[PDB]
mmCIF file of C-alpha atoms and ligand atoms in Angstrom:
data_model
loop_
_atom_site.group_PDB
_atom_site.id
_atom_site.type_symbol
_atom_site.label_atom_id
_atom_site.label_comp_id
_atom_site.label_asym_id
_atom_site.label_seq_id
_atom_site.Cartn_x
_atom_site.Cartn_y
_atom_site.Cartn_z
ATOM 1 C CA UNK A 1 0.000 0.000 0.000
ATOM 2 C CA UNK A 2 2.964 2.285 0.809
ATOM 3 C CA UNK A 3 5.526 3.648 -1.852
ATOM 4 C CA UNK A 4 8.319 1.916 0.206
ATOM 5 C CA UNK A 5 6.172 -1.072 0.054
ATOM 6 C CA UNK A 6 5.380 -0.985 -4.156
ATOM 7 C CA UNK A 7 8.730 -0.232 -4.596
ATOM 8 C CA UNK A 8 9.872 -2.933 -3.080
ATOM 9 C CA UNK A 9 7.604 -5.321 -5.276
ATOM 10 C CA UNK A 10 8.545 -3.201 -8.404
ATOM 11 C CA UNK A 11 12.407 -4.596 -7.388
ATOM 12 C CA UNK A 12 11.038 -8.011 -6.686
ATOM 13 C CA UNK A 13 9.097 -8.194 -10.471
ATOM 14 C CA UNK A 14 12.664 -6.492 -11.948
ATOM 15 C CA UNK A 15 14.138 -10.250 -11.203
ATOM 16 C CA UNK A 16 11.913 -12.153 -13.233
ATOM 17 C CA UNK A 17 11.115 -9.218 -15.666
ATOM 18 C CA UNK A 18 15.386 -10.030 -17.397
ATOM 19 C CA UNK A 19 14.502 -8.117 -20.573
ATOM 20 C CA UNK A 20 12.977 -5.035 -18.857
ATOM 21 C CA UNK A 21 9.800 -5.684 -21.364
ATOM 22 C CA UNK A 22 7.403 -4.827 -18.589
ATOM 23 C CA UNK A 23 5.900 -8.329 -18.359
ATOM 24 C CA UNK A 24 7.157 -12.426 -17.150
ATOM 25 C CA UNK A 25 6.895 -15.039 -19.244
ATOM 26 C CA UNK A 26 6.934 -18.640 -18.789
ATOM 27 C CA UNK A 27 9.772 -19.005 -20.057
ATOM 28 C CA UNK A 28 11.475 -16.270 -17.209
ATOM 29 C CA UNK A 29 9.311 -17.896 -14.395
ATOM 30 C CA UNK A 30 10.651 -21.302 -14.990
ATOM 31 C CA UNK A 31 14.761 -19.595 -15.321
ATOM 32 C CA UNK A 32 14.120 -17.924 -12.333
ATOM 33 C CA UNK A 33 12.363 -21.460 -10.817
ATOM 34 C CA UNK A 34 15.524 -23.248 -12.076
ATOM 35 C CA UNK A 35 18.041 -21.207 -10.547
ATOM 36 C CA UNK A 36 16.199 -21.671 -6.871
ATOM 37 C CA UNK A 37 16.716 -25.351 -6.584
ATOM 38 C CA UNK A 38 13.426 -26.046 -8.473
ATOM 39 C CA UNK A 39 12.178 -28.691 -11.175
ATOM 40 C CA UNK A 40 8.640 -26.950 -12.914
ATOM 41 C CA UNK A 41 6.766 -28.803 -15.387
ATOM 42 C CA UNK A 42 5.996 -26.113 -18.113
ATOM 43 C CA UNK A 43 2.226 -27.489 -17.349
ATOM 44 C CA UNK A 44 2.968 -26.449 -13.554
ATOM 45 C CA UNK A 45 4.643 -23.070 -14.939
ATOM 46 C CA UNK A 46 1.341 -22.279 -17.476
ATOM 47 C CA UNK A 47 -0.559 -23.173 -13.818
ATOM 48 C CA UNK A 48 1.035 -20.385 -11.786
ATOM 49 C CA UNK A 49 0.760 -17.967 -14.811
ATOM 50 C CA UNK A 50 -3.599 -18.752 -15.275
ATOM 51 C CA UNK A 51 -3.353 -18.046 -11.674
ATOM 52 C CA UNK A 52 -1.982 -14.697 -11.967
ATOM 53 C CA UNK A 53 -2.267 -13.430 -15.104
ATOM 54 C CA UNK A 54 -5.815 -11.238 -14.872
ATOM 55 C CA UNK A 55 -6.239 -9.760 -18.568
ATOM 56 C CA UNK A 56 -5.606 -13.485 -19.787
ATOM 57 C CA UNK A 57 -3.316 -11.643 -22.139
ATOM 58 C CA UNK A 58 -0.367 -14.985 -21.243
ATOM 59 C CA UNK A 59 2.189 -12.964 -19.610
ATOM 60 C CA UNK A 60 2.331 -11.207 -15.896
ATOM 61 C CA UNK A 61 2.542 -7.115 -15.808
ATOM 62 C CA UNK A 62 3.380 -5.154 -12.555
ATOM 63 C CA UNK A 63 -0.002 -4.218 -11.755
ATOM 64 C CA UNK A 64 -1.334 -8.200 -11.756
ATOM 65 C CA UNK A 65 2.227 -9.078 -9.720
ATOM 66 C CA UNK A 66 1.415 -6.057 -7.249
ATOM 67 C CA UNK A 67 -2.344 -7.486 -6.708
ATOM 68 C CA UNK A 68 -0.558 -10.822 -6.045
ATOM 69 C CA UNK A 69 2.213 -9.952 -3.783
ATOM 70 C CA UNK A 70 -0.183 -7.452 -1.562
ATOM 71 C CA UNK A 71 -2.408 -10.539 -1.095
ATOM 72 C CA UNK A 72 -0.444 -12.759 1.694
ATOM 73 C CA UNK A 73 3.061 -10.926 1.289
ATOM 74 C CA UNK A 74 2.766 -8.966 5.165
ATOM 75 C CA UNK A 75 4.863 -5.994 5.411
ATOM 76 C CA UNK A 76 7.472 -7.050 2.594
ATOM 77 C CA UNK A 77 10.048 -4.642 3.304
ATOM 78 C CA UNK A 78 13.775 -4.960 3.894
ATOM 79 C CA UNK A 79 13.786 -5.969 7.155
ATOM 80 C CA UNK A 80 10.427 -8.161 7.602
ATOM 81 C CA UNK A 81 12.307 -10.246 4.364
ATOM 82 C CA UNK A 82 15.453 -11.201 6.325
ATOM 83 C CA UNK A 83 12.908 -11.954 9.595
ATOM 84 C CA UNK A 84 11.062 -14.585 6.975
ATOM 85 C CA UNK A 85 14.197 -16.106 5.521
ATOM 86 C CA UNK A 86 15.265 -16.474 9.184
ATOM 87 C CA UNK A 87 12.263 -17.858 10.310
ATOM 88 C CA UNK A 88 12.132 -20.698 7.344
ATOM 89 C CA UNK A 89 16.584 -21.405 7.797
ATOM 90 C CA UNK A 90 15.718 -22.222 11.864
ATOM 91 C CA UNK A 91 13.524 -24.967 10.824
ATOM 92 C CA UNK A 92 13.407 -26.480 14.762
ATOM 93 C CA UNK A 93 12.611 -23.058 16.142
ATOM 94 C CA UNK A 94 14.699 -22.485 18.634
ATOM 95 C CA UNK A 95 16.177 -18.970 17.190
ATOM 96 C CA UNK A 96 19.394 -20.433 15.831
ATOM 97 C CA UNK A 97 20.728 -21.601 12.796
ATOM 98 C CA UNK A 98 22.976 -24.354 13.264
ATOM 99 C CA UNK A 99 25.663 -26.439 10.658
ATOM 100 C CA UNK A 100 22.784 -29.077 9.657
ATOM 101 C CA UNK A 101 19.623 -26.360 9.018
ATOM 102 C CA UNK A 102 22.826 -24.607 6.869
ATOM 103 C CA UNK A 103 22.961 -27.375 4.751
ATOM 104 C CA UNK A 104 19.478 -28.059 4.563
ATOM 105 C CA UNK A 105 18.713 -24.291 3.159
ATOM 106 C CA UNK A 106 21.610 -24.551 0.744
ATOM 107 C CA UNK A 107 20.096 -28.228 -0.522
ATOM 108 C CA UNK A 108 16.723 -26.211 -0.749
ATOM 109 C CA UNK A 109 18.447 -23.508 -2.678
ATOM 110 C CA UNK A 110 19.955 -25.528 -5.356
ATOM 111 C CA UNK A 111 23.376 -24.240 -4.057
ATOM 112 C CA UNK A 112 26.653 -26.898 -3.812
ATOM 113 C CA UNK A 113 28.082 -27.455 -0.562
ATOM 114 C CA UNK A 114 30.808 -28.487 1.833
ATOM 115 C CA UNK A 115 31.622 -29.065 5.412
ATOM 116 C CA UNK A 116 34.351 -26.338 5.364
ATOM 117 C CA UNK A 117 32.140 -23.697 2.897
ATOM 118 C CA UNK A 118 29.376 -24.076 6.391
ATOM 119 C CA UNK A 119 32.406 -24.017 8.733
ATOM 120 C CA UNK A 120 33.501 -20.907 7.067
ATOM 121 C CA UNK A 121 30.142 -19.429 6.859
ATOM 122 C CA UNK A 122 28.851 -19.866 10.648
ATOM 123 C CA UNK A 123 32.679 -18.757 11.634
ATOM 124 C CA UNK A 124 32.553 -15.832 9.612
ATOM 125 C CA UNK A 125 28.807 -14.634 11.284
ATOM 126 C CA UNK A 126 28.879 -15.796 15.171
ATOM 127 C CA UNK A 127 29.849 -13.145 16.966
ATOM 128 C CA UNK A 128 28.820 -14.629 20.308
ATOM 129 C CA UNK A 129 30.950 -17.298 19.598
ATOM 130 C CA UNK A 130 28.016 -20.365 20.637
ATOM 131 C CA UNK A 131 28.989 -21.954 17.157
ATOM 132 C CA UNK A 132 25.175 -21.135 15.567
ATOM 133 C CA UNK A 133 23.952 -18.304 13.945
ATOM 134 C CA UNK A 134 21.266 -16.138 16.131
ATOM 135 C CA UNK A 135 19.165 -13.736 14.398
ATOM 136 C CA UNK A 136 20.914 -10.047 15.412
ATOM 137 C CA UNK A 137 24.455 -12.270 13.634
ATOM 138 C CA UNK A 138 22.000 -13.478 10.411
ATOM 139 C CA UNK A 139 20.912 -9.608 10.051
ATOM 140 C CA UNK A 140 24.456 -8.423 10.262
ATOM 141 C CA UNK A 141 25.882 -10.787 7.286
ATOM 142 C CA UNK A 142 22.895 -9.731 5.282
ATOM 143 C CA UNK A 143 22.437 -5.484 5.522
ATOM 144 C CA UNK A 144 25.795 -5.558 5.505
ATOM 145 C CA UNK B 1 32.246 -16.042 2.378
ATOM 146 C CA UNK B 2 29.512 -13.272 3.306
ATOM 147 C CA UNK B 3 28.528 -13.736 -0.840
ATOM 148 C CA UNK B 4 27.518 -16.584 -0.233
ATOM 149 C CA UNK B 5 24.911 -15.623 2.609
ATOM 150 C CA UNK B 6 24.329 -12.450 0.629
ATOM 151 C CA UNK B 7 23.551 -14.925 -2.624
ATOM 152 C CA UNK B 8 21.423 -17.538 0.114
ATOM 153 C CA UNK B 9 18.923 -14.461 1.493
ATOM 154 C CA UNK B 10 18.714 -13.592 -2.260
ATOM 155 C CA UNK B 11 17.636 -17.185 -3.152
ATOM 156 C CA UNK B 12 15.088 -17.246 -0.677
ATOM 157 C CA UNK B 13 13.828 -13.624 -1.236
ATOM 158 C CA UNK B 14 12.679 -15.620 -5.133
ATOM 159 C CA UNK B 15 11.478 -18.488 -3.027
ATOM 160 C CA UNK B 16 8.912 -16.691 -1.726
ATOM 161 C CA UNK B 17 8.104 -14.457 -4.776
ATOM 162 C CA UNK B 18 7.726 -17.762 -6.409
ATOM 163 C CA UNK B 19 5.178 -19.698 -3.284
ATOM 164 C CA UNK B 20 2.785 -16.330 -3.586
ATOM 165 C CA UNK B 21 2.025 -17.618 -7.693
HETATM 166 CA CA1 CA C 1 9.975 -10.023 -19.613
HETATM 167 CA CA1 CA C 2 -1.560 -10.244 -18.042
HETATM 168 CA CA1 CA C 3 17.610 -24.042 14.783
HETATM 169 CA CA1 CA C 4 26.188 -17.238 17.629
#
């Protein structure tokens, strides 16, 4: 509803939107799909596109993505973003990431791994030194 | 390498572009 908040969006539809033609295809759904750790079925692509795509017209402007991501997106700022991607890494809850949930987001992802990449990765952010990754350590490797 | 939280957050940012479809 906010300027801060469409903006925000407008960056969001900029990632699928590659050419800068003002609308996503398909085709840039499924690239962007593919690059998250994802496997679509152009019939589950064509799916998500019906879904969205209000004029029928086959592709996804910025004012049908907008109506989307105001329905179920909360706040969807900078901050409440890194509070969600937190949320979902801690999958047992207990407000730490640890070496296993690591690996388990970067599996998710579609990103490679190693012991000593996640070594390197929790060293580099706990600055309590407990050998997990609290929240106030997640949101300083990320703003900055 | 902070990149590679910096690439994870961006990831997941798509992930949930992608779930509101
Ligand atoms: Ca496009
Ligand atoms: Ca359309
Ligand atoms: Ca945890
Ligand atoms: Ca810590």
């Amino acid at each position: 509803l906010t300027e801060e908040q469409i903006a925000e969006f407008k960056e969001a539809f900029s990632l699928f939107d590659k050419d800068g033609d003002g609308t996503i295809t398909t085709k840039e759904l499924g690239t962007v799909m593919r690059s998250l750790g994802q496997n679509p079925t152009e019939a589950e692509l064509q799916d998500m596109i019906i879904e969205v795509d209000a004029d029928g017209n086959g592709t996804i402007d910025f004012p049908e993505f907008l109506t989307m991501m105001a329905r179920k997106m909360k706040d969807t700022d900078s901050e409440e973003e890194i509070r969600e991607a937190f949320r979902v890494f801690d999958k047992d809850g207990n407000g730490y990431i640890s070496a296993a949930e690591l690996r388990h987001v970067m599996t998710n992802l579609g990103e490679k791994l190693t012991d000593e990449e996640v070594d390197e990765m929790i060293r580099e952010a706990d600055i309590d030194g407990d050998g997990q990754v609290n929240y106030e350590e997640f949101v300083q490797m990320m703003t900055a | 390498k902070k990149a590679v939280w910096h690439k994870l957050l961006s990831k997941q940012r798509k992930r949930a572009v992608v779930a509101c479809f």
